[PDB]
Each structure stands twice: as structure tokens, then as C-alpha cells.
Amino acid sequence: IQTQQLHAAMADTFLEHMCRLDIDSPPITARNTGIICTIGPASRSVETLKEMIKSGMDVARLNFSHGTHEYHAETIKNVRTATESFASDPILYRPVAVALDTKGPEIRTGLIKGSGTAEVELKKGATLKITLDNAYMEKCDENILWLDYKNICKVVEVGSKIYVDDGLISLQVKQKGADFLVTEVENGGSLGSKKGVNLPGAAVDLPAVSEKDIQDLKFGVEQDVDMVFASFIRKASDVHEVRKVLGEKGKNIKIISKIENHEGVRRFDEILEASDGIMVARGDLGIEIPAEKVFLAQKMMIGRCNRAGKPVICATQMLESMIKKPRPTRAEGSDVANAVLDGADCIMLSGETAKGDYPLEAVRMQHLIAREAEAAIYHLQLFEELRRLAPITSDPTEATAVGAVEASFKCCSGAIIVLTKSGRSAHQVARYRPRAPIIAVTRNPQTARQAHLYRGIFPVLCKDPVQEAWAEDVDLRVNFAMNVGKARGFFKKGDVVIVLTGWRPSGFTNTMRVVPVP
Amino acid sequence: IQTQQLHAAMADTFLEHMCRLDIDSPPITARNTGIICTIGPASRSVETLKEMIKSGMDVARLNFSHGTHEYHAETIKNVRTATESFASDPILYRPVAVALDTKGPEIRTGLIKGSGTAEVELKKGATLKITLDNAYMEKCDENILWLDYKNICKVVEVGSKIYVDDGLISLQVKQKGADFLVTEVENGGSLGSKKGVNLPGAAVDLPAVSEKDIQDLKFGVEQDVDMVFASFIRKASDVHEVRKVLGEKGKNIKIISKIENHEGVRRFDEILEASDGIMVARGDLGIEIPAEKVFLAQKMMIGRCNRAGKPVICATQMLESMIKKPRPTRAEGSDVANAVLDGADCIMLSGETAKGDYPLEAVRMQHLIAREAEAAIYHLQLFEELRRLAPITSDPTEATAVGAVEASFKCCSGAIIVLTKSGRSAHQVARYRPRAPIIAVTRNPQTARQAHLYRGIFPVLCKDPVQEAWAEDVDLRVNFAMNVGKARGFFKKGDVVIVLTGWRFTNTMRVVPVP
Amino acid sequence: IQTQQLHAAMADTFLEHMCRLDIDSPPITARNTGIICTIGPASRSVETLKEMIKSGMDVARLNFSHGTHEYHAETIKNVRTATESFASDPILYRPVAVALDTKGPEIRTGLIKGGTAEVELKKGATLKITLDNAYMEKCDENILWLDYKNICKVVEVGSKIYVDDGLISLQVKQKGADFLVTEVENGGSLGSKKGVNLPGAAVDLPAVSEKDIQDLKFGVEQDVDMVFASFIRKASDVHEVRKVLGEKGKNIKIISKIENHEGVRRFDEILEASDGIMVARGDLGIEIPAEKVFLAQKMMIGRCNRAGKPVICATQMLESMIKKPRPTRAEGSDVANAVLDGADCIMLSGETAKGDYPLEAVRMQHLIAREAEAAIYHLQLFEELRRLPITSDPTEATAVGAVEASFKCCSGAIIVLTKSGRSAHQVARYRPRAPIIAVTRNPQTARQAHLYRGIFPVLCKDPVQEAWAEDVDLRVNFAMNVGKARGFFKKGDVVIVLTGWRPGFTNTMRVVPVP
Ligand SMILES: O=C([O-])C(=O)[O-]
Ligand SMILES: O=C([O-])C(=O)[O-]
Ligand SMILES: O=C([O-])C(=O)[O-]
Ligand SMILES: [Mg+2]
Ligand SMILES: [Mg+2]
Ligand SMILES: [Mg+2]
């Protein structure tokens, strides 16, 4: 029995490729898909974070929809303490990125009357009056509901749908009153305090970057975060408002645009051009559009990002039941697998790691599934199509990278070793989706952390001083990657790896060697 | 914003096909993927079953792991009452099949000290002793657990892992004592009564068809069920035993083999050729094999069933969260869409329809998702592959079927209408996975009910008596299909459809306008 | 072994398709590529023409660059006598088409002085060219007359001039007041009334000369089936020919001959205006560098296949058979690769008009074309042809359904009932392996069907029936008998039958066993 689905890899049709997928064909040790973990009460402590990292966390996500700067500053410090606790052995050190997820133009309800911790029951068919009068902002109940978007009545009409609390409650407007927004409860259910509101289709006029988002983004610059997940990006100019707030100081912070409503889907191309990457934010997306269409937008966005060479993240509810249970549902297992099969660079955990009872188990499961799914990719067709859908180029670095990927398929390489200052050389390889892991050796700490955005890049940070004679410094960076691979089980002595290097001291990568492991 | 993802249909690469998927491209009205609903307390009533059918239920599954013959007989009559409640309008009548899912070689624990509602906590690292002694069968607690598999000790050894309650609790064998199988709790969890036990990697020597299974199968023959879902099929031998029990009286009942353990995957090809169809039984399968590997087995089995032209069902936890909530998670929506993309003929609901609070909404969600995913199939590549990975016939019906599918892709027709007595002609069309719905006109009611196992077949049961003129009896059945398709919104007057009939072998194809 | 290269037919790659081509896999009896023969002194006797027909000739080409109307009228008369000599058995009768190949804008030298002897032109020698008619019968090695009075306006010092199928080349050395002056580059025996090419000159001769008008109107009176229009440079040339043919000749097919650089460059607009194309490699290889002709041939055949219009590969396919009874290996290669390229027809000129082995050359083209037809990689060809979209047109959908079915059941033929030919043409455009037996009652339809690959046209002279169903079966049975007599299939084989249903067009396909 061959390993890593290599028998299905040789199938001449996609149908026969499926027929050959073999549960007794073990995957390789390396896992190429990045795992982004939302950090929260269940995962904040240094000790848990050390375990989170050992279980495979690549990026810590902080959701500024909730929490104070004090809280998030402590979280980040704990993330950094846990991460740096492994620095004592640079062979086994893994950089861990920090990601700031903005609140964005959220609409929220007020507090339920009383203590504010209660819920009230909305009954199917009942009337619910929405009010903007702040006298009710802490007096919400089943008859009068307050919410924080003051211009709501200007963007809805009789017949407009309104969803509350993750889309669990639906209302249809039946009167725009003088002091009222009168609705009927279409889907009833329990209503707590400060729940999310979606106005599907409505031209919501909240700013893309609010005064609160400006504070969080500046805070993110001060805290040296590696990326921003910008909530509710509707258009290319929304990305500009994030970018100008990040300013010159934040010029190297990646802006991942979160697509979560119909306008963002419709304007995806202009958004993708303006962004450093994309998040398929399926939570709001499946409220904003019919939930049965989310997989279309997911596959469209992943496909276009692979085509553009830009990082794409699949997010929200992929292991949801593991908030309460130690094992995932069969739908959750196949959802993680299919996100990798679609071509997602990273997958994400929100409540599973932020507040659930089984954060470590959830991280470990994404690790296990992604590694199985990575072997089950039909590389033959994928690589054929990525080359064909790619231009011809005067760029030798492009030609070197595609040559390296092609060679790595031919000799079933244990890795592709790339020396890179900015990441670009490693990113160029990853865009061709080799099956071998891409060990990117860099001395730039930010490059190393940001590399998790790209499928297959295993970033190793070299802290050794620069060697005189650049020939000797190229070696002992290759050798550093050789020792990481052996220590991690990616390959052993006598295996073949591919090594990408330049011709002199950034963008001079032009040399591929097919090199045995010493 | 075009229709039914036809822009994505035109793409020259799968990557560009993905890039072209369009949330503003609306699917056709017809939904090709069959929906199987497990019936239970939440869905047993004639009132609910009528709504189940209205929401899109095609097959009623009865799980004989639980319940009595008297109980199941009442469920079955309710299904037929609700189904026939629509039989007065043959233009809108939908056949509903009945499926019997056997118990099979299940292992169960006993009752917690007291009731079936009591639970105890099992703590990580604690000792738990398993007993086969019936003195303990109603005195299970945190130290002693009874299960009903009398021979378990001759099948495990020290170091073996034992899973309880959907694999949520795991134990490791530490000693094989004289009266007690003593284990250490590995995964802690609350343990109730009568929970399923799994023994991955053990040669479980329970009979494939037990004495309970025989009387359930004979009952199914008496009750005129359309198909059997046979649990824990491990080898072709097991299928033959089910077919033997069904006997001559049940020779037309379809046997779907449920693949839920390692041996059934390893022996899949021989199980498939012995079987009429396959169920990817993901619940147990995910406990028997590492859960991260299930999608491999799912795609392997769907691919091989597509290759063989046999029905395949994807089952278990597709919309699990809708047992308690009125909308699925995003993983659940994705799971359903991807099963259809994978090529499954049918998708299934178990707890969502049997006992949860939103059985109707779960059926409607599978209906909505399946239909969106059917349009998102990359038919260009799929039709090319099914043709190449298919033998050369000499069979005139096979050639007519593939030509009809080819023609239907060319003239983007509203349906393929086929007159079939046995179903075979429609099955041969469905095996090539046309985009267009297949309206199979039959007078055989069992053919009508069993047609749901095949993707795309909309069975319509002609109740008219036969006309003397065969040429006129053909037109009467064809025009009945035209009225069905117009009443249901599949196409309208002037649209183009494909019509498959015989010469008094289904061997003639007509491209005709809807009148 | 397998037959008709079916083992190579199911290869997954073109490379493996080549690897499986098998000299021991014999082809089917039917030959799909049309054979066009230039009728001339070696081939216009009634008795020879009978043997041409029996050897495989489908179209008689008459080259109006030479001969008088009276001479050509007799040739047409003899062709029709030979052809109708087989009408006494309607089952073995093959329609034979008559094609009129125009003179077009030719340039010709005058007569060698007497008495058509030849003079030797020597490399390096001087040769004066005159336009003075005083010299038109006194050409020799020193002075040569030609009939293009405006030649001095379109050439210059340095211009190259080619005489006698490009075998003799001259370079212009001065333009005198009278007598252009020239040096011989390639020497050779110069005979009388030889053809002249001026590659890259704006030769302003009319597309349709007064002589062409007479010849075209002669063609109408003689009821010819098609016109091969020489030296078509642009769409408006095609329009000129069509206008001269006018209303009386409106059913005559116009095949444009692509013979120079301008015709290649403007190919698309010429193809659009034309009924089909001839790759006139003789002139074309003088007008453009000979090493580029295969580029223009493959381009033109590819675009004609893409457009569904007939294309003829012509000139020097079996040249050495003018004098020897066997072709060279390049000639065998040339014919095969023309068929593999996709040519609807292949042509003979001197091999049949004036050579010593006209029958052997016809038979060689028949033998090669049939081997090459089996070697076509139909899997790729059909996939790619299909990939061009699904039009509402139900005749198109039926045609592609029939071709797909014919691949599936390896049918002995596709039988098509057609008045105008169109349904049969639509089938041929998808290039089935099986022969297409087009049953028509129109004799011109039957003769023009030869322009489309694979159409074996049969002329039904049985009377119409009042019962449409009976009239269909009569014509289908006639095609069955034709196929049985010709060895295409036999009792028990399977054929595909394309018909209309109650005439109102071709929307019915049946997969039918041969009785
Ligand atoms: O904000 C998110 O992550 C979402 O909606 O999925
Ligand atoms: O038996 C079943 O249905 C399962 O385990 O999924
Ligand atoms: O006219 C022709 O036959 C040629 O030039 O090949
Ligand atoms: Mg969101
Ligand atoms: Mg089970
Ligand atoms: Mg010529």
C-alpha cells in the first residue's frame, strides 16, 4: 500500500482519483494548512497557550468585537510568553503570528430589561417593535427592542427582513412608524442582551472604519501585530480606510479582508486586488445570504484567491460542536477536509478555542484532518491548471519556483528549502501548491510569522549572526533547514530535498538544487 | 447573473469553474438528490409526515435498532396514510419509499442503577470494570458496566480500546479477569443507559444476520418495504445472507449495504458487487476508523458507486445541530453541498427528523442545499469521465441513454422523460448524471418508490388503465409526464424536452417541444 | 487482436494512442473520406470511368483551365453514362458528383515556335519577356510571350517570376519599353502555354473573367453539382462567383480554392462566404514557401472542421503514380495525414487525368484513407468538437446524441433520412467513426453529400407512401440492404437511425438491430 494517497495521485481522471482514496495510506508528517485560533477565556493562559502551540496553532486571532485594550494587551503578552518559551531550541521553534480582528460596522441590540443577563422568548407571529430611543437601550424585551444603528429606518422598508442573534431570529418589517419600526416575528426564539443584527440587502451606511476601529487599529500597530482581519469589507475603498489608518508605521501589516455580505461577494474582485488576503467569514455570510449558497461563495473566493496567488482563510463553525464535546461531528470533519480540498491556505477556530471546553482537542483535530486532506488533493490536475492559468513571464524567479515545484513532484521531495528575506520567494513556490512542505529560512521575524498565511510554508527563523563569505552564510542556512526537517520528521538522511537560493546578496532567487539530506 | 451556474458550467478548468460559482445564479426548480428521513417520535404522526413529504422527504427510514414490530407497523401505516393522502391528484402525487434499517451486530451497555435517565460521571484515569454477567445488566454505575456482547473477552486483549456512546467515552483494557474486563477510563464523560459500544480493530464475531435481524427482515417482506439498509456489512457473504433471508418473496427489495467499519471498507468492492447500493454510514464509521479519515472513505465509496452505476447514500450528522436549532451550522451546510458534489444519489437525516425539534426545517434545508449544489457540479468534466470509465455496450438501451444525456446537455432541455416498467431505462440515464431532471413514468408502484435511490429520477406513477393502441398508450404516459413537469415548474409550454420510449428495450429518443 | 484500432481508440493520451496503433488491427469496410478525381485523357472513356467508380471515385473534377465546352460536355456525358450504368441495381448504385474547376485569373506563356516542342533555359542565361502578341506563337529560349498585359506594372527589378508549376524561375533584371528583361535562376525545359506565378504581386486580373462567366453558365446548363473557384483572394470574389451562378445555379455549392498568400490571410471571410474550401497546395506552394504549406493546410482544415464546412486536400498526394504503379512512402504518409488532419475529401489530379495508373491511384487513396480513418483519435476529436454550445436547435441535439450513441454501441452505421442533406451534414460535423448512410430522394442532395466526411449517400427511387411510418421503414430498410450489400454491417449488428417523427425536423433517434 502506497503512502500519502500516491496511488490516487496517479489517477488519470478525477473520478478514478476519488475511487483510489485509501484510509490505509498514511499521510506525511508535515501539515501544510495554517491553523488560526481565536484566543479567549478558554485559551488565554500561558500554560494553555504553550499547549495550543504544541497542538499546532500557527496564528493567534484576537476579536476586538469584544474586550478591552487591557484584556487584549495581556492576551498578546501571554501569546508572546508562550511562543518565546520554545526559543531555547531554535531547531524546534515555531513562529506564531498575532492577528487583530476588527469589530467593524456591527449592529447590536440593547440589554434585556432587568439585570441584563436574562433572555426573553419571542413567539412566531408576534409583533416586536424596534426603537432607537435610548430610554429603552437597557429595557429590551419581547415587545420593544432597542439597537444601536440609528439610521436603520432610512435603509429598510415594509417587507425588509431583519435577523437577530446569529440569524436565529428573523423579523419582517410591517410598518415604519413615527417612533417605531414595527415587525412581525417570523422565526421566534430566545433573545438575550447585545445580540448581532443583520440587514440582508439593505445599504447599511455605517462607516467601514469607525472611531472604535481607529483605536483598535492604532493599538494593533503599537502591539506589533502581524495582520488585521478587517470586518465587513464591502468594496475596495473600505480596504483603503483600513490601510490609511494603519499608516506608514503599519505599512507591513497584512490586511485580510473579511467577506461576509452580499456586496463584498459582488465586489470581490476589486476587494481582492486591494487586499493582502481574504477571509471567507461564513458566519455573517450565511446570514446575509441564503445559508445554502455559502459554499458557492466559499468555493468562488478560494478559487479566485488561488488564481491570484493571495492567501485565503476559511472561517467560522468548522468544528462548532467541539465547544461542548470532545469529538467533532461527521459534518465538521468533512467541512475541514473540503476547505483544504478547495484550496484554503488557512482554516480557523473561533468559539472552539476562544470559549469552549475542548480547545486543545479542536486544534489537534484540524491538524489531523488538514494533513489527511492535503494528501487527497488531486495535484496532477491542480498543478496543470495553475500553470496553464498562469502567464508567461520575464521573471526568472517565477521560472525558478515553478521548476522547483515540478522537480519536487518528480522526485517526491521531502521538502523545498527556500532562503527568503521578505517571504516573496517562498510565497512564489506556495502559489504552485507543491505537496512537499516549504521550509522558508528567514532572519526577518515578521516574515516568519506572516508566512503562515500561505499554504505549505513552514517558517524557520535564523538567529545566527551573518557569516562573512555569503557562500558560507547560504550554507548553515540550508543546513539549519536540514536540521529542522530531520528533527520534525519531515525527512531523514539520504532523502532528496530541493533547495532554492540566490546568486548574490533580496530578489535574486535563481538557483534550484536537488540535494540529498546529509 | 445567469441561471443554474451555466457560466461556471462553460469553464475549461475546474479552477475556473470554482472562480465562476455565482450566488446570484439561481438553480432550477427540480432537486435531483434524494432525501431520506429517519422516522421517530418527532415525525411519526400522519400530520407531520404529510408536512415531511411537502418539504421534500423521498424515503422514510425506520431504524429497527429500536422499537417493536407493532410500533414500526404503525409508523409504516402512517407513512402510507400520509403518502396516499396525496394520491387523489396523480399529477402532484410523489411516491414515498419505505426503508428498513436493521439492528445488526450492535453492542449496547445496560441501564444505570435506577432508570434509563440516570447518568454517572466517568473520570479520566479511573478504573471501570466491564461485566457480561446479567446480574449487573440494570446496575451499571461508575465502577461496573454491563454490556450485552457475551463474547467480548475472546475478541479484545490487553491494550485494546473500547468506545462508548458515539465514541464520546473511551476506555483501555488493562486486565482480562475471570469475571470482569477491567479498564482504565481514557476519555472521561457522562454515561447514560443503553449506549452503543465500538471495538475498533477487533474481529467482532457477532452474526452478521442475527435472529432478531431475520424476523425484522421477514417483517419487512410482510410489510412490503422497498429497500433494506443492512448494518455493519463486512463482506459479500453478509449481503448474500440478507438476500437469502429476503428470499423469493423479497427478491425485488433493494439491499443497501451500510459501510461502517474497517473491514467493510477493505472489502468494499466485493460488498458493492453483491449489493444493490451502498450507505456511507458515517456515525459508526467515524468511530471504527480515525474520524479525520472518514471523508476519504466517503469519497472513495461515492466514486466507486458512481463508477459502478449503483446508488450511494451519504448519512449521519449532516445537519446534526438542527436537532436543537432551527438553522444549520456552516460546516453542516458545507457537508451537504459537498456530498452532492461528491456524487451521492441520496442524503440522509437521522436524529434531525426522528427526535429533534425542527424535522421540517431540516428536510427543507437539505432540499435547498442539494439543489444549489447540483447546479455547481462541473458537469463538463463529470460527463467526460463517466463516458471514458464505462465499457462499450452492444446494449441498445445503454446507447440510447447516453445519447439522451448528451442531447440534453446540448439543448439545455427541461427534462428527460422515460417510460419504464422496471426502472432500468431511467437508471441507465441517471448513471450519466444529466443536469436535467429525469421524469420516469411507470405503472409499477414499487419501481416508482425505488427510483429515489438514483440521482435525478422524479418517479410519476401512472394510474390510468392501459389503452389498446400501444402508440396511444405511449402518448398518454408521455403527456402525463408533460403535465407533471409543467405543474411542478420543471418546464413550460414551448420548452424542449427529451423523450425515451421503446418500439413495442427503450430504444428511441425524441427531442420534442412541450405542448 | 482488436479491429479498427479500437485498442488505440481508448487510450487516455494522444501519446499512448500513437503507441497502440497496430498494423494487424484491420479497418472496417466503409471508407469515409471522399475521393475527387480529375478526369482527363487517361480517364474520360466510358469504360475507364466505370472502373474509376468501382475503384472508389466519388467526384469527377473537370478542370476548365483547358479544353473547350464541347470537349467537357462529352466528358460529363461519359461520366453520367458510367454512373447510370450501375443504376440497374439501386442497392449497389453510388451517386457520382460532377465538379467544375474554373480557370480563374491564370497567367500563361505562349507557344514554342514550330508544334509544341520545348526549349532549354539555362541557369544564368538571359530571357526577354514580351507582351507583344506578334510573339505569342514564336516563344523560344530568347523571347517568351505571356498573356498578362499589365505584368510590368506589378513587378520590379529583383522580382522573381515562376513558370511551369514553379519549376523554372526568373529574376527581373530590367523593365524595358518593350520586352521585360530577365535572368534564368532555375533552368528547365520550357514548353508551351505554361503557368506563371508572381508571388507577392498585386495581380489585378478579375476574379471572374469573361471566360469564367461562360464556363460557369455552361456549368449551370450541364447541371454540375459544385464549382471549385480558382485563386479566391477575398469574400467578394466568392460573391462574384455566386452572382454569376445566380438564381438558376443557387443550389450549386461553391468551394473556394486557397492558392496564395492573400487567400490564406483572408481565409476567415472567404470561408464564411463559401460552401467549402480546397487547399490548393500546388499553386500555394509556389506562392508561399513550400516548407510552410503544411501550416496552411492544417490551419484551413482545422478552421473548416470548426465551422462544419467541407475541406478538400489537393495536389501531388500520389504524384509518383503518374508513372509508377506504387506510391512513395511520403505519398502514403501525405494521404494518411490529410485524413488525420480532418480533410473531408482528398483529391487526385495528374494521377487520374493523364497518368498511366489512374485506377491504382484511386485504389491507393481508398486503401490509405480507410486505415487512417481508424487511426483518428476520436476520443479527443469528439470531446473538442462537442466543446463548441448547446443551441436550442433540436436537430443539432439529436445529431450529437446519435454520434455519442454510435460511439457507445460501436454501431455499423448512422442512417439518416434527409431531403436537403442538412441532417446528414450535422452528423458528419461531429465526425462519428461509423459511416453515415444518408437516404435521400433528391439526386443533387445525394451527389453533394460527398463533400462531407463519412456520408455514404444513397438515392431512394422508391415512391413515397401515404403512411409516414411505412415510408420511413421503407427508406430505413433500403439503407439496411445497402449496408448489408456493401459489407458495412450484417444481421444482428446495431445501427443508429435518424428520422423525423410525423414530418414537421430530424428529432428521432433509434438504436435498431439489423434484421
Ligand atoms: O466575523 C466572522 O468571523 C464571521 O462572520 O464568520
Ligand atoms: O448506522 C448508521 O446509520 C451510522 O452509523 O451512521
Ligand atoms: O488548382 C490547383 O489544383 C492547385 O493549385 O493545387
Ligand atoms: Mg463576522
Ligand atoms: Mg451505525
Ligand atoms: Mg491552382
Author numbering:
A (entry chain C): 13 to 517, 519 to 531
B (entry chain B): 13 to 516, 521 to 531
C (entry chain A): 13 to 126, 128 to 401, 403 to 518, 521 to 531
From the article:
Pyruvate kinase muscle isoform 2 (PKM2) is an essential glycolytic enzyme involved in cancer metabolism. It catalyzes the rate-limiting step of glycolysis by converting phosphoenolpyruvate (PEP) and adenosine diphosphate (ADP) to adenosine triphosphate (ATP). Tumors utilize PKM2 to fuel their growth and proliferation, and at a molecular level this function depends on the unique property of the enzyme to exist in an active tetramer and an inactive dimer/monomer form. In each PKM2 monomer, there are four domains, namely, N-(residues 1–44), A-(residues 44–116 and 219–389), B-(residues 117–218), and C-(residues 390–531) domains.
Specifically, N70, located near the AA binding site, was mutated to D (hereafter, PKM2 N70D) in order to break the interaction between the carboxylate oxygen of the AA ligand and sidechain -NH2 of N70. To gain insight into how mutation of specific residues in either end of β1 (N70D and N75) regulate the activity and oligomeric state differently from that of wtPKM2, the crystal structure of PKM2 N70D was determined. However, the B-domain in all four chains of PKM2 N70D aligned well with wtPKM2-FBP. The AA binding pocket of PKM2 N70D did not undergo significant structural changes by replacing the polar sidechain with an acidic group. While several studies have reported FBP to co-purify and co-crystallize with wtPKM2 even without adding it in the crystallization condition, in PKM2 N70D structure only a portion of unbound FBP molecule (comprising of the phosphate moiety) was present at an occupancy of ~0.7 in all four chains. Interestingly, significant movements of various residues occurred in the FBP-binding pocket of PKM2 N70D (right insets). In both chains C and D, the sidechain of R436 flips out and away from the FBP-binding site, thus breaking its contact with S434, which is involved in H-bond interaction with P2 phosphate of FBP (top inset). Finally, the sidechain of E396 located at the dimer-dimer interface swings away, breaking the H-bond with R399 (middle right inset). Thus the movement of key residues results in disruption of various electrostatic and H-bond interactions with FBP, leading to the eviction of FBP from its binding pocket, consequently perturbing the PKM2 N70D tetramer to a mixture of tetramer:dimer/monomer states. Taken together, the data effectively demonstrates that mutation of N70 breaks the flow of the inhibitory signal from the AA binding pocket to the active site without altering the binding of the AAs, thus confirming that N70 is involved in transmitting Val/Cys mediated inhibitory signals.
